[PDB]
Write an enzyme that holds these catalytic residues in place. Structure first.
Site, mmCIF file in Angstrom:
data_model
loop_
_atom_site.group_PDB
_atom_site.id
_atom_site.type_symbol
_atom_site.label_atom_id
_atom_site.label_comp_id
_atom_site.label_asym_id
_atom_site.label_seq_id
_atom_site.Cartn_x
_atom_site.Cartn_y
_atom_site.Cartn_z
ATOM 1 N N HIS A 63 0.796 -1.226 0.000
ATOM 2 C CA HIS A 63 0.000 0.000 0.000
ATOM 3 C C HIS A 63 0.822 1.266 0.000
ATOM 4 O O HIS A 63 1.934 1.290 0.496
ATOM 5 C CB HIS A 63 -1.027 0.007 1.147
ATOM 6 C CG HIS A 63 -0.441 -0.070 2.525
ATOM 7 N ND1 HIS A 63 -0.234 1.045 3.310
ATOM 8 C CD2 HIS A 63 -0.116 -1.136 3.296
ATOM 9 C CE1 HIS A 63 0.187 0.669 4.505
ATOM 10 N NE2 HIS A 63 0.265 -0.650 4.523
ATOM 11 N N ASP B 69 5.749 1.819 7.674
ATOM 12 C CA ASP B 69 4.467 1.278 7.248
ATOM 13 C C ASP B 69 3.807 2.220 6.249
ATOM 14 O O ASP B 69 3.602 3.394 6.543
ATOM 15 C CB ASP B 69 3.560 1.097 8.465
ATOM 16 C CG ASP B 69 2.293 0.334 8.144
ATOM 17 O OD1 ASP B 69 2.086 -0.017 6.966
ATOM 18 O OD2 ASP B 69 1.445 0.041 9.011
ATOM 19 N N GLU C 218 -5.413 1.271 2.244
ATOM 20 C CA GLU C 218 -5.273 0.021 2.983
ATOM 21 C C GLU C 218 -5.473 0.320 4.475
ATOM 22 O O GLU C 218 -6.058 -0.481 5.210
ATOM 23 C CB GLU C 218 -3.883 -0.602 2.760
ATOM 24 C CG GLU C 218 -3.634 -1.893 3.553
ATOM 25 C CD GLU C 218 -2.918 -1.678 4.897
ATOM 26 O OE1 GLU C 218 -3.034 -0.582 5.491
ATOM 27 O OE2 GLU C 218 -2.241 -2.624 5.366
ATOM 28 N N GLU C 219 -4.997 1.482 4.916
ATOM 29 C CA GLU C 219 -5.121 1.867 6.315
ATOM 30 C C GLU C 219 -6.574 2.075 6.713
ATOM 31 O O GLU C 219 -6.883 2.184 7.900
ATOM 32 C CB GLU C 219 -4.330 3.149 6.588
ATOM 33 C CG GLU C 219 -2.825 3.030 6.371
ATOM 34 C CD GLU C 219 -2.132 2.101 7.367
ATOM 35 O OE1 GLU C 219 -2.778 1.676 8.349
ATOM 36 O OE2 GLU C 219 -0.927 1.805 7.172
ATOM 37 N N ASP D 197 3.817 -6.432 3.345
ATOM 38 C CA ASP D 197 3.475 -5.495 4.402
ATOM 39 C C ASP D 197 4.565 -5.529 5.469
ATOM 40 O O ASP D 197 5.556 -6.248 5.334
ATOM 41 C CB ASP D 197 2.122 -5.890 5.010
ATOM 42 C CG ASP D 197 1.322 -4.688 5.506
ATOM 43 O OD1 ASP D 197 1.864 -3.877 6.288
ATOM 44 O OD2 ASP D 197 0.142 -4.554 5.106
ATOM 45 N N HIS E 265 3.257 2.343 13.807
ATOM 46 C CA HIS E 265 2.317 3.459 13.940
ATOM 47 C C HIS E 265 2.797 4.620 14.795
ATOM 48 O O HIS E 265 1.993 5.347 15.383
ATOM 49 C CB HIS E 265 0.980 2.961 14.487
ATOM 50 C CG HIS E 265 0.198 2.153 13.506
ATOM 51 N ND1 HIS E 265 -0.962 1.491 13.846
ATOM 52 C CD2 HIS E 265 0.398 1.915 12.188
ATOM 53 C CE1 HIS E 265 -1.443 0.879 12.778
ATOM 54 N NE2 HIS E 265 -0.637 1.120 11.760
#
Lengths: 332, 330, 328
Positions: free
Chosen positions: A62, A163, A193-194, A216, A300
């Site tokens: 992504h 990410d 995607e998130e 990923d 994150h």
């Protein structure tokens, strides 16, 4: 392992649904140089086709980053935001936010009194709502963690938005270096995607692949992880095992790794998702899927950290899988 | 002057380690116009501007709050302790600039999907390796610099306290005209850990008049209307127990004379300012505090208004020039 | 000298009452080697070993944490208040040594200071007062010296008598030195470093060293304590510590091959050095400590080798220092 290209892939603007702000163009250009064709669909997915005969495979990473959006602006020019994806308000304390306004990129800081939302007020240097807007801010303006690339040494580095930009970069690199291959390949930079793996879903439907691999990032052993985390930095790429994983495809992965002598980590996953591999597997009549991940720490947060050695082995393995793939029976 | 101001702000120097960078900046910048400059056994930079009377001491601390390494675990992670008013809250998902044997190196505090559990990742996989990289028990670090000018006037950056006042003071010093007062400008150390530096420097100087140039709280979100000062409204000067009335009325006059906007804020108690130990130094000193209001104190995003920093400098030098002997007896 | 040591440790003297026993011992033993020995108006014992320079003050506090009698009830039980860092936790089922005009009298706490009642065997307020008890009578942890083995031992009031012993022993063995040395046995340290403050003001040293005890790695410390028993004296690093003096200490310990541990003391220490450093015009200070486990309890335990190595380093440092710039 191009550090400059890696960094710009990592810092290019592009929150979920706003991938067109910067990252998409990079992916398209770098892919158009080696692909037989590159398109961009309605939602913004970038689909590069590398012609082969069979089987037809789809690999995706992504392009979207988690972020924030301005809900409103108060009389004193402060901004009240909301999250785009899994944004931890804890990671918004005393942090700088890069916003994309009419008048270009503008910064803002989330203070602290000398946690839940709207306890989170952003200061942008304005004194009134009117002044904030004049600066280019408006309801709907989106923001991202302010870039900050930290090379800690030879191998390890920390930065916002590994990410999934680190896996995006690994995929792109493997694709630039791809050699002979009889598989019909589609390299996809997916969107949103998130926020629901909605990009990979649309693209896998259009592509209708037989095999699908989601690249990923995944959790790596770190402090206070209580030992529940299997993968470790520097230990090579990771490949899940579980219901979402096709055994024939996964078994083939082991061999490729064995053959090319690439360290490969195994990670339990008794469910699917949040990779694009979730929606890829249940796409139309069924897809044989696998997950190839780069382990990172502090997912994150503005300090996600990875090891360049893993990135490297991920690129090698990705490439080797693509060239080694030929017709097979994926039926379990 | 955004160039110089940023330099003063990002120059190394946590409490007790001001010699790592900030000390020299200050000295150099002042040797240019100061009649004499020296540094005591604690690191206070004392600049003299010979005058007749009265003898005045003006100070701004050079120390930053920060962290120190308590120990290194087997996996190469650092366990730190706070130097100054550091809140664990402002340490999550943040970068730390450490000063190791091999030079400045970075580390990052992590998180998961009270200091004890504040572990720092420096990219090592072993204690030997962390040490190999230059990390030792006792190694110190500070918030990583990140200067952000929001617009023409406002800017946010770590360590506005008290480096912005230190700048302001230095600047007004460089622009000082004629003064009747015998002036001493001090770059104090260890102020964040008990106003320890000002104590010593004031005992040596033994001034009749003393002024502390520090930062104060400005109105900001969630303050509940408790904070009086506002960014953009000029320098601030307290009123209360440790503020000599005569001296404070004077500043009120100089302000209006030069028309500098001046904010007033209550301080019902002797504050965590160098003017706290300056007043009770030796036989007593007439003291006042001159502050630059800032938001989000003690965090990486402290924010100020250049227009305030500007006026603070204007008021600083004006006071220093208008100052003439008078009675400060309350 | 386990006998001189146990005697320095057990000698009576809580904060403000150092004249009850430890003071005279400190004075007597220091008078034998020092050029002069004096006692200031607050009770500090100041021994001078004349030298050239730099002028250095070394201090170890003579005071103990303890209790004081607030009042006596009808049934002759005593109600006490703490003198220093005493926590009622350590008073349960413990014997307390009180100092009355009639002499030393003992009491026991049986089985929040409003639940700490001391029993002295009296049956009435009058009998308690007849035994020598008054409002203001002070007390201490009953002495109880346990040598666990060849090196380790446990006893009340290792803090700070163990460092006091060390400093005294170092002073007695002191050889040729260029510095103008002032060995101080300070008072009222456990209640505000009150003694060392006044003592430094008078001495006005250029260099100052505080010899106190520090925490050693022990059960349940959850890895937060650096120093360990048996690995030698300890020397802090931080804001309260002068870099050049500390650097010097390092080289001295290396030159004599004395194990030296390092400890991060991030904040202004809770030792006499705290006040010495901000004294008058400023002083280049440092801290020399013996690590011990279970601080502030009846079982504070230490390692003899550390005590010995502390005496050595203390001696070496004093014979080795000379004029040098301490400006950081």
């Amino acid at each position: 392992v191009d550090w400059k290209l890696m960094q710009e892939i990592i810092e290019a603007p592009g929150v979920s649904g706003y991938e067109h702000l910067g990252i998409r163009d990079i992916v398209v250009d770098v892919l158009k140089e080696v692909a037989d064709e590159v398109k961009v669909d309605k939602l913004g997915n970038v689909i590069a086709h590398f012609k082969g005969s069979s089987p037809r495979i789809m690999v995706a990473a992504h392009m979207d980053k988690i972020g924030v959006m301005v809900n409103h602006i108060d009389k004193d020019g402060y901004l009240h935001i909301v999250p785009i994806g899994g944004v931890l308000p804890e990671t918004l304390v005393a942090q700088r936010i890069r916003f994309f306004t009419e008048k270009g990129e503008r910064y803002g800081v989330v203070g602290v009194l000398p946690i839940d939302w709207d306890q989170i007020v952003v200061d942008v240097g304005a004194s009134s709502k009117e002044e904030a807007e004049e600066m280019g801010f408006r309801v709907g303006t989106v923001g991202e963690f302010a870039p900050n690339f930290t090379r800690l040494n030879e191998h390890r580095f920390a930065t916002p938005y590994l990410d999934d930009r680190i896996c995006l970069y690994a995929m792109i690199e493997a694709a630039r270096q791809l050699g002979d291959h009889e598989a019909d390949i589609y390299i996809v930079g997916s969107v949103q995607e998130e926020v629901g793996l909605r990009g990979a879903r649309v693209a896998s439907y259009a592509i209708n692949p037989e095999v699908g691999i989601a690249m990923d990032v995944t959790f790596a052993k770190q402090p206070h992880d209580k030992g529940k985390i299997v993968p470790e930095l520097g230990k090579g790429p990771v490949m899940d095992v579980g219901p979402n994983i096709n055994p024939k495809l996964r078994a083939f992965a082991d061999e490729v790794a064995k053959k090319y002598e690439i360290p490969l980590q195994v990670e339990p996953s008794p469910r699917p998702t949040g990779t694009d591999a979730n929606v890829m597997q249940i796409n139309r009549e069924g897809v044989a899927t696998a997950v190839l991940s780069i382990p990172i720490r502090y997912m994150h947060s503005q300090v996600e950290l990875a090891d360049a050695r893993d990135v490297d082995n991920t690129i090698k393995l990705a490439k080797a899988l693509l060239e080694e793939l030929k017709p097979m029976d994926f039926t379990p």
